Structure 1
Amino acid sequence: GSFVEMVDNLRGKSGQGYYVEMTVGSPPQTLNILVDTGSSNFAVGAAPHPFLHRYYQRQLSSTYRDLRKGVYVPYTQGKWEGELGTDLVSIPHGPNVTVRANIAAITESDKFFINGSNWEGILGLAYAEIARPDDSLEPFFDSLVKQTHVPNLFSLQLCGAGFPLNQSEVLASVGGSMIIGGIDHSLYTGSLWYTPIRREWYYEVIIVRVEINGQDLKMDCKEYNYDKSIVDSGTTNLRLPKKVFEAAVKSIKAASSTEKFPDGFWLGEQLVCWQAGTTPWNIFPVISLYLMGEVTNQSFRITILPQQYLRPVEDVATSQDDCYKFAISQSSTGTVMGAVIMEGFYVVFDRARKRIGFAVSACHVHDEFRTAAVEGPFVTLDMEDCGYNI
């Protein structure tokens, strides 16, 4: 696996999402697009907006075709509405192919675009079942795969800087790689461990076991996938269902309760600061997620460091310090393996064989002591029972 053109083609930050550059229409207009495995709608700003430095102008694409249907997408936070249509799309640092795709011209947004986030659109990489207005609205990836020789698979290497990033610095830094139709061997170390996709809608997985420093949380594993568990590049934190959240937090407090912390810290509302270079990593637990594997009774695990679940943030005050926001949050809609998780791993969305691969990111953020890992195989029983059912 060797796709040199697409290595380093993303930019961004776990806080505001990762984006790739695309083009649209004839002649073609360049837009930065947020990569989002947590939805299935390709949509772009098509009208001016405080935060947007540029936008899609249909009136200038000779190949644009209006579909005369409105759409409305509501995300976990933020929502928009637009008009549907099609036009020709390309990725400059992707494969040299052009593709007619459904595109939503976003005409009203609310809490959607981020100030100086640098992206102007969203690329929903998930499956048609969750496309709005309905599943007959074919997702971008589907079209790419149907109309060209690109294989039905892509991979993401989300890279964290290790420290806060400016807007200037985000633009100039490399934010990661999105390999389309492939796996690049140089972006990961160790081995790819695949988990099955439970159902083609979100990229849904089953978590069978959860460990903090190796200590099982001892829960009916059904609790970890209540009511789904998904991988999502457009979610900042690892988000967890209420029962599990409290249980997990408790455990971490215990593991590093050589320091009690502001209560608003855990609820993600406050920073924590240490002097430059003096961040006490070793005092913080590692988290392990065991994921249903390929064969019956077989699973594997992935392990994240505190470097993953404590987001670096710029302290406007002091600024010569090292500050973090706690990047694990509560959820009332199942588990979400957000970007904070993924920046540990090369992740492989093997749509063609209904499975998701994990490997250790060649670019991951680590200390001279521990390091993140993808280990297996483990033997767990009656895994199907961890799946939750409506």
Structure 2
Amino acid sequence: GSFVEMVDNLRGKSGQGYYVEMTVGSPPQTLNILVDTGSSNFAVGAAPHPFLHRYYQRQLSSTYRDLRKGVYVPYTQGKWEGELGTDLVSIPHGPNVTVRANIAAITESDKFFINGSNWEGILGLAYAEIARPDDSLEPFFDSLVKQTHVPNLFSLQLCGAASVGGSMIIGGIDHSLYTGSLWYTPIRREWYYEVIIVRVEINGQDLKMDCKEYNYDKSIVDSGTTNLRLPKKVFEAAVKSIKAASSTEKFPDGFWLGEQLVCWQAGTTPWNIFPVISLYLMGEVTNQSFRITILPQQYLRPVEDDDCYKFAISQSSTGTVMGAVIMEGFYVVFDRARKRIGFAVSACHVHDEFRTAAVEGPFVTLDMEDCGYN
């Protein structure tokens, strides 16, 4: 509570990410910035690229300082390169402070900006270890914490819908955004927001795989990604098992690949025939775990075109990526200070009549440490 300045400060178009309003420079230039717990660079467009609504103009900033060094970041999805500097940054619908963060002024890019999107930059919320050019470049939230008395902690409530909304509470937790209790899983290493998944159930049936497979080569919480991404073998077992639960109908190969939609007459979507999915996460206490459960309403994204949906669980090059499909069911707390991530059922999650998202525990799981890849 007492974080209503910040409630509902996230916007976006579904499948195009969530962004938050920010100001940089003196005088303050407003930009919409993509919120990404999957990287650690703060970067903005700095030139009149045709896709951009606005861009960062350093000429205008009296507080701008050049850093004279270049920087290059290749994501899976895309790539940019720019010039480093520092400036005064603030989040209007956040806590009224201002910090001197590093900024990547994007001078060239490819497949990074979305033609049609309403954002112009990316805010890397993860740790310095994975910042570019190297961990010497202080990530934004590190700067925010060192320079103010704002608590080393933030939380995201992403609410799945063309338009999408959500909240980023900075420095706090807002208890009206979740129901039930928060359960914490350890942040395994401070680079990505890495975690250990110790077990997976589909409608309640263990997928029966060595838990190490769930996390090769790592599992992370990534707000800049849309899908629940599973490692290849795990992905196979999962889809196989979902087909079985939904055999009451059957669908084209391409649906399970996310390349072809499936539609029903509006309001007749056979929700009951799709299984709830569960990830057990390592808990705070030795041999203790807990479970998060998402409904089909989370992994079937609606798409315009009847009621049509895209299958939004997909295969992963890395380990497990808990992206938007996962986060839109839960209030996620990034407790950097206590080095742990918190999950609670979201106040804004989409649920049907008979079933609901869940965070439950505790469970007994031995050898949880063995689920990690080393």
Q: TM-score, with normalisation over the residues of structure 2?
A: 0.99
Q: Residue 194 of structure 2: SS of its match in structure 1?
A: coil
The answer on whether the counterparts of 1:22 and 1:90 sit within 8 Å (CA) in structure 2 is: yes
Matched residues in 2 for 1:147 and 1:361: separation?
Answer: 31
The answer on whether the counterparts of 1:21 and 1:32 sit within 8 Å (CA) in structure 2 is: yes
Decide whether aligned partners of structure 1 residues 380 and 13 sit closer, same or farther in structure 2, where only a CA change above 3 A counts. Answer: farther
Give the paired residue count: 374
Q: How much does 1:13 deviate?
A: 4.1
Q: Deviations over 1:19-54 (max 9, x none)?
A: 100000011100000100000000000011121011
The answer on whether the counterparts of 2:184 and 2:341 sit within 8 Å (CA) in structure 1 is: yes
Q: Deviations over 1:133-177 (max 9, x none)?
A: 00010000000000001000000000012xxxxxxxxxx966010
Decide whether aligned partners of structure 1 residues 14 and 383 sit closer, same or farther in structure 2, where only a CA change above 3 A counts. Answer: farther
Q: How much does 1:114 deviate?
A: 1.1
Matched residues in 1 for 2:48 and 2:249: separation?
Answer: 48
Q: Deviations over 1:191-231 (max 9, x none)?
A: 00000000000000000000000000000000000000000
Q: How much does 1:115 deviate?
A: 2.0
User: How do residues 351-362 of structure 1 correspond to structure 2 at under 5 angstroms?
Assistant: 351-362=336-347
Q: Residue 218 of structure 1: SS of its match in structure 2?
A: coil
The answer on whether the counterparts of 2:18 and 2:164 sit within 8 Å (CA) in structure 1 is: no
Specify the alignment match of 1:165 in structure 2.
Answer: none
Q: How much does 1:332 deviate?
A: 1.6
The answer on whether the counterparts of 1:156 and 1:178 sit within 8 Å (CA) in structure 2 is: yes
Q: How much does 1:363 deviate?
A: 0.6
Matched residues in 2 for 1:48 and 1:378: separation?
Answer: 54
Matched residues in 1 for 2:346 and 2:37: separation?
Answer: 18
The answer on whether the counterparts of 2:51 and 2:116 sit within 8 Å (CA) in structure 1 is: yes
Structure 1 residues without counterparts, runs of 5 or longer: 162-171, 316-320
The answer on whether the counterparts of 1:13 and 1:160 sit within 8 Å (CA) in structure 2 is: no
The answer on whether the counterparts of 2:83 and 2:105 sit within 8 Å (CA) in structure 1 is: yes
Instruction: State, as a whole percentage, how many aligned pairs show the same letter.
Output: 100
Q: Residue 5 of structure 1: SS of its match in structure 2?
A: coil
Q: Residue 5 of structure 2: SS of its match in structure 1?
A: helix
The answer on whether the counterparts of 1:14 and 1:339 sit within 8 Å (CA) in structure 2 is: no
Q: How much does 1:251 deviate?
A: 0.3
Structure 2 residues without counterparts, runs of 5 or longer: none
Matched residues in 2 for 1:173 and 1:265: separation?
Answer: 24
Matched residues in 2 for 1:2 and 1:156: separation?
Answer: 16
User: How do residues 1-390 of structure 1 correspond to structure 2 at under 5 angstroms?
Assistant: 1-161=1-161, 175-315=165-305, 321-389=306-374
Matched residues in 1 for 2:165 and 2:262: separation?
Answer: 25
Moved over 3 A (4+): none
Q: Deviations over 1:251-270 (max 9, x none)?
A: 00111011121111111111
Matched residues in 2 for 1:91 and 1:188: separation?
Answer: 23
Q: Deviations over 1:330-384 (max 9, x none)?
A: 0121110001100000000000000000001001101111000000100000100
Matched residues in 1 for 2:14 and 2:196: separation?
Answer: 23
Decide whether aligned partners of structure 1 residues 367 and 117 sit closer, same or farther in structure 2, where only a CA change above 3 A counts. Answer: same
Matched residues in 2 for 1:37 and 1:263: separation?
Answer: 32
The answer on whether the counterparts of 1:2 and 1:185 sit within 8 Å (CA) in structure 2 is: no
Q: How much does 1:14 deviate?
A: 4.4
Matched residues in 2 for 1:143 and 1:23: separation?
Answer: 15
Q: TM-score, with normalisation over the residues of structure 1?
A: 0.95
Q: How much does 1:9 deviate?
A: 0.6
Matched residues in 2 for 1:78 and 1:294: separation?
Answer: 35
Matched residues in 1 for 2:20 and 2:137: separation?
Answer: 22
Matched residues in 2 for 1:116 and 1:8: separation?
Answer: 22
Q: Residue 213 of structure 2: SS of its match in structure 1?
A: helix
Matched residues in 2 for 1:183 and 1:18: separation?
Answer: 19
Q: How much does 1:2 deviate?
A: 2.4
Q: Residue 223 of structure 2: SS of its match in structure 1?
A: coil
Q: Residue 6 of structure 1: SS of its match in structure 2?
A: coil
Q: Deviations over 1:37-74 (max 9, x none)?
A: 00000000001112101100011111111101111001
Q: Residue 285 of structure 2: SS of its match in structure 1?
A: coil
Q: Residue 223 of structure 1: SS of its match in structure 2?
A: helix
Shifted more, 98-107 versus 10-19: the winner is: 10-19
Matched residues in 1 for 2:13 and 2:252: separation?
Answer: 26
Matched residues in 1 for 2:211 and 2:14: separation?
Answer: 28
Matched residues in 2 for 1:240 and 1:325: separation?
Answer: 17
Shifted more, 236-245 versus 107-116: the winner is: 107-116
Matched residues in 2 for 1:305 and 1:174: separation?
Answer: 19
The answer on whether the counterparts of 2:14 and 2:164 sit within 8 Å (CA) in structure 1 is: no
The answer on whether the counterparts of 1:8 and 1:174 sit within 8 Å (CA) in structure 2 is: no
Shifted more, 134-143 versus 111-120: the winner is: 111-120
Matched residues in 1 for 2:178 and 2:250: separation?
Answer: 36
Q: How much does 1:117 deviate?
A: 1.6
